[PDB]
């Protein structure tokens, strides 16, 4: 896994809601996370997951102590909470009086994600979405659920980083070569990769390179998703 002192180095300025013990408890729901492959592969997977988490929750500024990548895990809830984030569904019905705005380390959003995430975790997140912003174990589990779950045609980010996803010829033709860049593409490639404004993807890479440096691992190849088409 990762030790308490290293978690406290990566996340030196975090919101104290996000405890190390909560992260460790959540990771036990997905025992292959960070335990797959040799030491370099494990370190890159952990750095990659934390880079995305940090991008989505960062409270940094350019002159912040320890630099602009040292302020991950500051945010819990989406700040703009007026829309319900509800698309009508017979499988995952929007609960009366509830909203599905972003919550937790990967900003889980929409009834159509809270539904299946809760089903997989054995939790009624569809009818109690506020659980994600109440309980840091649940919060971390929702982020790991996303990271560990394939959604065809997309592989899991876990499988990409650990060598368990081999691209098809169409993937390769589209520039989807395994590495950090493909994880950005999976998470939000329609807006952030290809010809999207690359500011946000570049920020994710900045966090990733910082965390790789702190963990003592090379970031590897194929970091940039501007050279890459979103999955169909």
Author numbering: 0 to 231
Task: Please give the exact wording used by the authors of the publication that reports this structure.
One of the physiological roles of chitinase is to defend plants against pathogenic fungi by degrading chitin, a major component of the cell wall of many fungi. By revealing the evolutionary history and loops appearance of GH19 chitinase, we discover that one loop which is remote from the catalytic site, is necessary to acquire the new antifungal activity. We demonstrate that this remote loop directly accesses the fungal cell wall, and surprisingly, it needs to adopt a defined structure supported by long-range intramolecular interactions to perform its function.
We chose six substitutions within 4.0 Å from Loop II and introduced them accordingly to their proximity to each other’s. Mutations A, B, and C increased antifungal activity 4.7, 1.2, and 5.4-fold, respectively. These substitutions increased antifungal activity while retaining the same degree of chitinase activity. Furthermore, crystal structures of Anc4 + Loop II + A and Anc4 + Loop II + A + B + C revealed that their loop II structures are retained as in the structure of Anc5’s loop II, namely the antifungal active variant. Our mutational analysis revealed that some of substitutions are conserved in loopful-type GH19 chitinases and six substitutions are needed to perform new function.
